[PDB]
Design a protein around this nucleic acid. Structure first.
Ligand code: WUX
Ligand code: GDP
Ligand code: MG
Ligand code: MG
Ligand code: MG
Ligand code: MG
Ligand code: MG
Ligand code: MG
Ligand code: MG
Ligand code: MG
Ligand code: MG
Ligand code: MG
Ligand code: MG
Lengths: 80, 669
RNA sequence: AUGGAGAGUUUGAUCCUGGCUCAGGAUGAACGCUGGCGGCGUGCCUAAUACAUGCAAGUCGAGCGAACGGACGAGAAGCUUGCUUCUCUGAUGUUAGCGGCGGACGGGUGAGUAACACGUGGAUAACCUACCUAUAAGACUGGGAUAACUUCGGGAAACCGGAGCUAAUACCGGAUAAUAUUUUGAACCGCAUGGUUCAAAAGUGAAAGACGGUCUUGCUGUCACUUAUAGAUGGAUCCGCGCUGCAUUAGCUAGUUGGUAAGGUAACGGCUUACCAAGGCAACGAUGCAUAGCCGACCUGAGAGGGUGAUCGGCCACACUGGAACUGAGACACGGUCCAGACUCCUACGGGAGGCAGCAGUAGGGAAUCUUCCGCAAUGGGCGAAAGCCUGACGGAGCAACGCCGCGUGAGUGAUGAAGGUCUUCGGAUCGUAAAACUCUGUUAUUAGGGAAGAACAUAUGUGUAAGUAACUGUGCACAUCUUGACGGUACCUAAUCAGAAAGCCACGGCUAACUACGUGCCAGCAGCCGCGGUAAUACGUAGGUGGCAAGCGUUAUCCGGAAUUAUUGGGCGUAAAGCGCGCGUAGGCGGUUUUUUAAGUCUGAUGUGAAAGCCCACGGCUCAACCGUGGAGGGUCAUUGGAAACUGGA
């Protein structure tokens, strides 16, 4: 094993923990917004806005690709 | 850069002794002491003692493994001969002593096992004097025997060392006890007399009654030892750590260096008559002798060699003058008590291991590329036991041949050859133990399971009675007609004279064209056995009459006639079976002569005679080769391992009635 | 026009047919004998067999805390003012760790792959792209942790946990910003789907500081950071055509083929799922089986063709075997992770570890293929502001007649045909101008001196100039100076000494250049074919001589040629091998005369491309040559586009 490889293992584990937390949060927001739009709720627009916020922040963190975020926003805001 | 130890501080020594004398224990203790401010492996181990480099080779004791002793004494400078205190000199002690004498190696004797019950230092020294006829004298005295053994009196410096424990530490240097002072002075006088018997200056100095200086006495002892005229005898117990330091001190003080040793003589490859003296000089050309070859599972093939003259650096090319090829020295290793070290250079008087030598067997000479010197090789004993070997599964015969080749390269004393007459592969070795170990090694290491037995004896046939016989063959009945006829007198020839064909034809009754065909037919029919299938020998065939047809006569017809004549002569002449008889010369002490002669006569052989030779006796006899199976083991049992023998084919003799009948029955069915 | 040779052998003899064989060229060759040197190349083709050991990927202190360290230089005098502690300052420096970037390149291998893998030509209005370049706009305001470290505990080791504390260009909230997303209107355009631009609004997150200059903490340089649009680079997908053997492999396919909806992806798409339908492929060879990395090229041939896919370049695929994802611009990752498997190793028996198809090397296999070498000086790469560090890439050296090319092993005179070998017709012939001897030379060799180029730089130090500045330091550019070589004191040059150290291999019956004597006597032996050898052997072995080559010469193996002997070029089937025993008839192949029309074939012009290296031609540089370099020419059944209508094809 190479010293830099061992270091990369450590940093990869840290980055994975952070990324999976953020991705799970954004997926939860997306599902909540989709449910709110599907069944009209007074919180619909705020939930959709939160979902879009998290989707774009994920795209900027590189967790998802820009086109993936674009598809999510397109479908969410077309439903809403 | 610079050799860490000079030639004046190098000691190449070998530990040799009878079985269980303590060679391995002594080597282990030596390595431990040299390494402190232990696994023994590899041909030689390198250590340091008091600013001196010490190469140690531990040898085997069994007579079956005399190859190792030979190949080590060839390249070594000094030897430590270990003796069990309770028994002194034993048969293999004598054998290794004679090998060291043949190689002119200085020796120091070390009486180990002083703590063992029955230990008797005086008796061991007396055995040195009597059994070996060696000018050996103690340079020490033991205070105590068996459990009482507690001190050693160095006589050169008249100083007592008292050992307070078995750990080998906390030795007290004190003055000789008063009660032992007279004995110590007498022993010192005896030692001085022994050395003076070789040194004239010391003899005059001692006769003058003037006190001998410690340095002068040490110098005289060193001179005598290196001349191989004196043998210092020490004592101790390697198991309980007593006398090991003194033994190492004696190694330093008395055993020679590669300078003190006599030079080495070699032959130029292009001028065999030319002689080259290779002295221990780093600045001279590089010449070394490869004395061991092995395969280490980590580094590959290792070639252990001793360097006599010159220097050689790792990562270079050398010449194998014996094989006349170029070898790449890629890596040089030296084995220490606990680890192997890669060393960039080897100098005269160094034992090292090369990695990467291909086609370099034991006894080869490695010389500088430009040079072409060839050092003297080693002579090893001829096989004393032979066994017909054969794989249990014929599918492994190629593996068996390859294993035999590799084993022969590893071990000079192990031979394998194919016998044309019997078509059997025969393995020859130094003893039953040697062959058993080799068979097991072939079975396991080389994964070729083999079975071994007594070699087959190629018998012969002969005619005991003379007779005139006729052979006629008429085949005119169908198609081509053939006719042949011969009259031949068969006579028992003088034993060993071979087949003799005579042509007493008068009047051209047998045309001269067909006579060679008749002789050839006789030769073929005799090659084919007439009584048991073995070739017929010692016969005089006299073609004295015959007939022929102007057309039907042919070479094949006359060969048929000769074959029929031989068949009828076999019917009429009472053939007998002959067995090879070996001229056997047995050397042994006279006290076993009766046993040896009894065994000879019990082997169906006869004692030709007896004669003294040196300090032993030689018995000459003739024994059947079949009855000579397993003779070495019986001889060693009869002579306590002191008996040796040689055998060579001598002649053929008639097999007794019962044995011949058994042979005939076996061949028939 | 640049280019094409044949011979032996079936018979008593002949012509034909017909196979066999030979003369040529080639090689990553091996072996046998032999072996002087230099230059340039090439060197595990077998076991994608297993691997001891060393090395092959690090770097950044000008991102960060901490630790070690201790100049310059404080204090008391031990009365030693030269040695001394802690109460200091502590600079030049070094590091384990956090963080950034690089570990996806470079290097190895050809196992798998018959497939859009590759080649060639196209397409993407179905796509993605860190570092780099350009332009424009920004970089505001707060916060919580954690490594390190200290401590306690458990371990043979691998190393593990608990507690407490601290940093950042590490992480997170909020603020403003959009060509990105939703909706509405408008303009224009295209190859269906659609594309480009403008105007309105609603949802909406980015960022960071480090080292300096001016010092007015205001301004500001370099580097770094963020958003957007372009360029460059790299990658992805699709398509026409081309690219292999077998039918003693004929049926294959059920997410299979299409549609609808959704999901999924950078992206289109049965890519996946649900539903409906029964479609899709195939004698134009599906499916199955076997074998195989493909190409530029390489060998051979007059060509057409045939054979091959080392070295070098491109593309692909793989990293003990199989699966998977993580991080990341980029991997489903040779010297990363997880799981499973085989195998192997260490262990204190509690438990741990590994993957040379990287460079060397080991073992093994094999007829057979090298050093566990030197250096980053050159070129290239990663990191760094830079010096610099790393770099088994690479540049060199070492070994091997393995190949090609060059030069040696001497030159002149020398009849007096010397000795001696071999033959003889016993005169002589021949080895032979060969030798001897006299003269000459030193390529080579030995010795002693001189001694390159490859080296550009970068950095540092001086100025000059240009954008910006309020002005510097800096930044770009230009001119100068110090310094940088593993090879290596090697190449090369000079001076002296000696023909002195340096020739072997095969063949001599015909093919096929070169003949005699002895020995042998169908024996020993030779042999590519025909054959030779039983007493007169140019064929076996030796000797003299001769022939061909020569540091090589022979043998074996394999490929093309000769072979028109699979015949398109370029053959045949009465009797030599070859007409189905004969009809009827399907697909296919082929098809009578004239007129009009089309332009698929056919012919012709333009444009792009067919990398580089290679082959061929020319020129230039190594003293020559090989070799190296530079131009030219060539190579498509290639594509787009414009033209002609005789023939074939269509109407
Ligand atoms: C000094 C040392 O180390 O001796 C060793 C080394 C040793 C001499 C060995 C005996 C034997 O195996 C030897 C042979 C000849 C065996 C055949 C080949 O394998 C060769 C290559 C091999 C070479 C040497 C070898 C390996 C030893 C030995 C004797 C063992 C004792 C026994 C008692 C009865 C059973 C056996 C010893 O311990 O004295
Ligand atoms: N009593 C006693 N035993 C000893 C001594 N030296 C060795 N031994 C033992 O005797 C045997 C000798 O064997 P070893 O040393 O291998 O001898 P080798 O056959 O010469 O190699 C072993 O069992 C040793 O332990 C000694 O000095 N005294
Ligand atoms: Mg022993
Ligand atoms: Mg393959
Ligand atoms: Mg041709
Ligand atoms: Mg990697
Ligand atoms: Mg590896
Ligand atoms: Mg390798
Ligand atoms: Mg082998
Ligand atoms: Mg042809
Ligand atoms: Mg016929
Ligand atoms: Mg017919
Ligand atoms: Mg080209």
């Amino acid at each position: 094993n190479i010293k830099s490889a061992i270091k990369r293992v450590k940093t990869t584990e840290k980055a994975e923990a952070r990324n999976i937390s953020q991705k799970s949060a954004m997926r939860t927001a997306v599902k909540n917004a989709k449910t709110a739009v599907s069944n009209n709720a007074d919180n619909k627009n705020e939930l959709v806005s939160l979902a879009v916020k998290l989707v774009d922040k994920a795209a900027q963190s590189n967790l998802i690709h820009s086109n993936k975020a674009d598809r999510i926003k397109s479908q969410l805001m077309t439903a809403n | 850069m610079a050799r860490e130890f000079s030639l004046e501080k190098t000691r190449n020594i070998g530990i040799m002794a009878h079985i269980d004398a303590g060679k391995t224990t002594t080597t282990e203790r030596i390595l431990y002491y040299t390494g402190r401010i232990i696994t023994i492996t590899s041909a030689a181990t390198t250590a340091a003692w008091e600013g001196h480099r010490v190469n140690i080779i531990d040898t085997p004791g069994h007579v079956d493994f005399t190859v190792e002793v030979e190949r080590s004494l060839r390249v070594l400078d000094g030897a430590v001969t270990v003796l069990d205190a309770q028994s002194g000199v034993e048969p293999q002690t004598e054998t290794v002593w004679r090998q060291a004498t043949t190689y002119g190696v200085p020796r120091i004797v070390f009486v180990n096992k002083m703590d063992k019950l029955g230990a008797n230092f005086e008796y061991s020294v007396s055995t040195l004097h009597d059994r070996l006829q060696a000018n050996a004298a103690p340079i020490q005295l033991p205070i105590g025997a068996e459990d009482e053994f507690e001190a050693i009196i160095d006589l050169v410096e008249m100083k007592c060392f008292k050992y307070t424990n078995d750990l080998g530490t906390e030795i007290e240097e004190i003055e000789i006890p008063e009660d032992h002072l007279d004995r110590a002075e007498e022993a010192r006088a005896s030692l001085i007399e022994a050395v003076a018997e070789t040194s004239d200056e010391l003899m005059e100095k001692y006769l003058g009654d003037e006190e001998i200086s410690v340095s002068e006495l040490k110098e005289a002892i060193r001179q005598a030892t290196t001349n191989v005229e004196f043998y210092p005898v020490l004592c101790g117990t390697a198991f309980k750590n007593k006398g090991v330091q003194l033994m190492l001190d004696a190694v330093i003080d008395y055993l020679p260096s590669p300078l003190d040793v006599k030079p080495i003589i070699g032959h130029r490859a292009s001028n065999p008559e030319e002689e080259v003296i290779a002295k221990a000089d780093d600045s001279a050309e590089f010449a070394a002798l490869a004395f061991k070859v092995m395969t280490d599972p980590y580094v590959g093939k290792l070639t252990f060699f001793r360097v006599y003259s010159g220097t050689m650096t790792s990562g270079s090319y050398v010449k194998n003058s014996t094989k006349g090829k170029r070898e790449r020295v890629g890596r040089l290793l030296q084995m220490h008590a606990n680890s192997r070290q890669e060393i960039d250079t080897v100098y005269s008087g160094d034992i090292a291991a090369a990695v990467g030598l291909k086609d370099t067997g034991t006894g080869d000479t490695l010389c500088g590329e430009k040079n072409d010197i060839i050092l003297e090789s080693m002579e090893f004993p001829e096989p004393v036991i032979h066994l017909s070997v054969e794989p249990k599964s014929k599918a492994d015969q190629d593996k068996m041949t390859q294993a035999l080749v590799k084993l022969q390269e590893e071990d000079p004393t192990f031979h394998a050859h194919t016998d044309e007459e019997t078509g059997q592969v025969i393995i020859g070795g130094m003893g039953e133990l040697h062959l058993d170990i080799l068979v097991d090694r072939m079975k396991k290491e080389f994964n070729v399971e083999c079975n071994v037995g007594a070699p087959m004896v190629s018998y012969r046939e002969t005619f005991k009675s003379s007779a005139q016989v006729q052979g006629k063959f008429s085949r005119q009945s169908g198609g081509r007609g053939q006719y042949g006829d011969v009259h031949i007198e068969f006579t028992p020839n003088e034993t060993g004279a071979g087949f003799e064909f005579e042509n007493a034809i008068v009047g051209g009754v047998v045309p001269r064209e067909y006579i060679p065909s008749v002789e050839a037919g006789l030769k073929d029919a005799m090659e084919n056995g007439v009584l048991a299938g073995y070739p017929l020998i010692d016969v005089k065939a006299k073609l004295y009459d015959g007939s022929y047809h102007d057309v039907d006569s042919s070479e094949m017809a006359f060969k048929i006639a000769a074959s029929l004549a031989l068949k009828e002569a076999a019917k009429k002449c009472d053939p007998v079976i002959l067995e090879p008889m070996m001229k056997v010369t047995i050397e042994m002490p006279e006290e076993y002569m009766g046993d040896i002669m009894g065994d000879v006569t019990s082997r169906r052989g006869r004692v030709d005679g007896m004669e003294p030779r040196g300090n032993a006796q030689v018995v000459n006899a003739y024994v059947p080769l079949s009855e000579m199976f397993g003779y070495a083991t019986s001889l060693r049992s009869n002579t306590q391992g002191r008996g040796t023998y040689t055998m060579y084919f001598d002649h053929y003799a008639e097999v007794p009635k019962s044995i011949a009948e058994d042979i005939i029955k076996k061949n028939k069915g």
